[PDB]
UniProtKB/TrEMBL annotation:
Gene: manB
Keyword Signal attributed: yes
Section covered of the full-length record: 505 to 677 of 680
Sequence positions that bind Ca(2+): D15, G47, G49, D168
Principal cellular location given in the protein's record: secreted
Name under which the protein is recorded: mannan endo-1,4-beta-mannosidase
A GO cellular component annotation in the UniProt record: extracellular region
Keywords of this entry: Calcium, Glycosidase, Hydrolase, Metal-binding, Secreted, Signal
GO molecular function: mannan endo-1,4-beta-mannosidase activity; metal ion binding
Amino acid sequence: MASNEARYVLAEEVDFSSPEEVKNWWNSGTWQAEFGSPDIEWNGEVGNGALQLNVKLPGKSDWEEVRVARKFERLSECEILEYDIYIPNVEGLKGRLRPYAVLNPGWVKIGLDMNNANVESAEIITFGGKEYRRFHVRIEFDRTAGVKELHIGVVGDHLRYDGPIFIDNVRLYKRT
Ligand SMILES: [Ca+2]
């Protein structure tokens, strides 16, 4: 067996292709940041369907968090999470991102500071003639009994930004 054989298989995938999927997500919190109005909605132009978070990040502190969540029935079986964040590549965008996730019940914080990035060096991707900074997040965690929902924490670190941020391609994997 090749040493690069994937030891995992895709158990759950959310690509936000339909706006109905957004109704399954909710905002589960803020700290030193705010949501706008509405807090979340669907966007059909980014990632051919993405979760749009309308955020207000003052960029004054090193942890400015907005958080969203969704139930996942099979989550206790899983050990790897991947997801993408896209931020409009607007003039002057500067700062650090500290994205992570939470398994719940149990409020189990996973991948803390495991996927940090300077926004100014992040990959650029284009959708519909517009540029985005891309942040791919990959988090490893233990099979955890009783967990039923996943929270995605989008955390700014002196990243002043008022506008939409996007989440896409939420994928959960279990070991074979
Ligand atoms: Ca998508």
